[PDB]
Symmetry: C4
Subunit: 219 residues, 4 copies
């Protein structure tokens, strides 16, 4: 009756992609999420999706903490929820990407987590944990491992300036990034540098992807 | 022991109209509500009631989010509670109205919801979901489908100005409305335009109703 | 394992007065309270106690809402907790008083409640519900029935001024009071008017009591 | 399935030191903590650790209330959590210390608690309860019994000034202290007076320890 994530939902007999209620160990009130029941067997809990630029992603700290957008469309689940999910078990991360030319690619990471051992994940900046890459999109996230999450109004990166403001996004910026999936929906090639929905290892630093979806599943 | 709404309360053997405790899926602490155990079989959870103008409804955003008034009289349950209720299952909406001339009418909607797929229903403005009308009061709500909730201190309507301020209420304003049940208790016909407890399809834009009650029941 | 109040604690086999954990229906996290297991059979949950003036009771709204002092001594449980307790069942109120001359008296009320039907008890001012007096101290509370709770920084009384500020306390002031148990610990007779720990029906308006304890038990 | 502390975790079959989920009686959502499963039989819940000066401990009131640092390294669990743990049962405290010269020592207290009978532990300043010393480090905490917790931005000590600011730490200061484990990581002997990680009874007032760990276990 109380699935902890989309894998529990799947194993309980629910095979259709869609919105379901999940109840993380330390977030007993629970919340709704979009479940991908098809990718590599299914059971993936989505936490980010870009697909048409209908939602503004250049948001501040509170928004990235609490989440925004809609589960059936573009959205960000919220770092407080992502933390609740990834700390209750060992999760893997799957990232699906799509360009404006019919092309698709993906990146899988054997281990993924946010603020895994932080006493206060929010004050600690929801530090990223990620490793073990494999896929077709190439790795554009391993360099971000260990970095705190930075937004336009809360700098915690390794740059002299605010990477989030400079690259119009919100991410576990270093100095500054190799991936920027929460960047501006610029739609394809653009002159501005690395400030769109980027995944450098696949499409470079001046090409804003058409679609992106970040999801997790217990290892 | 833990009814999720008034229908569960009814099915458990409670047949008297009154105040009962309910526990929505994602609001485990629960809260009290007024249950209508008579209308069309009973089991309706009330979330709004106007009946004598004793309570001020020209309130701000926090009040409409958290609720105000008293369960045994005029009140607004609060968008956070209405959201908790309508997202846990598919609900229908029933609206009972009464004028100052002994007359009554009602409007039933096969589907009703608030912020159904919003990651953060409050930030998303508790968007309205409603469809499938039937009744005697006529439909004065379908045009509001998809609109966010707007209050005098938080504009999210499709008007150049603030509909909530202009029509002294709080509603899922468009530009501006066909219904305004949270408007001023003006008592019958009035010169001011559409700023009373209106249900245009039944009594027009210049007649403030004597009674209104909005309630929901699982489809 | 989860007593809802001190009566449940008593009925479970706990006969010693003391501090115990209770879990109100709509406050599942629970909290600790002092239980009186001797008065008229025992099972009373204490919510207020004055006994030596060691604690300041001239506090603001947040303090009276959340509570202050210590369970083993002078304290105020907090209106949010008192509300959680009195709305889960029908409770009676018992008030024990003591003067500085060895004398004692008590007042019992067959029904007692705070914000019983308020959608938002805090915004509604935790309105008092009380009736059916009997005892030796005389009735000094029935006149306060229906009044909202007023503090020095939140006026909701029927006076032109702030009763709480004027009589240095916090109570369900009318205009202004017949009882003021949260008043200043003035110790016996005093020149200032009605601004001490008063229970007018027993000791008048210019005598601050030595001891007072307010507690509840399911009817 | 719901251990209340690390002793429950141990008794359930978990013998490895590490991070585990615990669920205090009045903090049902639960949280993670580091468990010491080796010291004197194991089952100790850690709430403070200093080991390399990588974390800033000169923090304000909110930080000491909510916690900071990481469970696998230097951290402070947070007074709200320590309170939730120590009020659910009778706990003993164990303090392990280490200097920069290979030396180690410890202090054990038969009884330990924070804000044990406070209606609102935070407003009451999380008062310290501690007694019954035994060990090799000597007692440097008994004098602090009964004192409230003081930080650089919230003075509640018995000093004319702010002990926390003066001795660059956060503690249950009196006037001012005999122990200062949350002080500056000064690394050994230092000229400044008593403003490092001190445990006076063992190493004096001008020697900042290399390691310290504070943990609790049910008596
Ligand atoms: C191209 O896009 C279409 C539309 O989604 C999709 O069905 C197809 O699999 C994609 N790839 C190719 C090679 O057509
Ligand atoms: C008129 O109002 C009365 C009073 O509530 C009610 O009993 C009655 O059913 C209403 N309708 C008619 C036709 O009397
Ligand atoms: C007077 O006070 C004492 C002390 O608490 C108490 O034992 C006694 O019952 C009181 N009443 C009388 C008549 O002594
Ligand atoms: C000295 O430090 C080492 C390193 O941690 C430790 O193994 C040893 O037990 C300590 N004491 C002595 C006497 O070596
Ligand atoms: Ca920076
Ligand atoms: Ca507008
Ligand atoms: Ca007044
Ligand atoms: Ca001081």
């Amino acid at each position: 009756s109380r699935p902890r994530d989309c894998l529990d939902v799947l194993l309980s007999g629910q095979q259709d992609d869609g919105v379901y209620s999940v109840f993380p160990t330390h977030y007993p009130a629970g919340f709704q999420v979009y479940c991908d029941m098809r990718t590599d067997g299914g059971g993936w809990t989505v936490f980010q999706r870009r697909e048409d630029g209908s939602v503004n992603f250049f948001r501040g700290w509170d928004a990235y903490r609490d989440g925004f957008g809609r589960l059936t469309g573009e959205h960000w689940l919220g770092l407080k929820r992502i933390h609740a999910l990834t700390t209750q078990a060992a999760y893997e991360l799957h990232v699906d990407l799509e360009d404006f030319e019919n092309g698709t690619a993906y990146a899988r990471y054997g281990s993924f987590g946010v603020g895994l051992f932080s006493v206060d994940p929010e004050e600690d900046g929801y530090p990223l944990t990620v490793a073990d890459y494999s896929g077709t999109a190439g790795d554009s996230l391993l360099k971000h491992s260990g970095m705190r999450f930075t937004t336009k109004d809360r700098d915690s990166d390794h740059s002299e300036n605010n990477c989030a403001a400079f690259y119009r996004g919100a991410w576990w910026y270093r100095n500054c990034h190799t991936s920027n999936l929460n960047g501006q929906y610029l739609r394809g090639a653009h002159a501005s540098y690395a400030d769109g929905v980027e995944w450098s290892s696949w499409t470079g630093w001046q090409y804003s992807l058409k679609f992106s979806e970040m999801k997790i599943r217990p290892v």
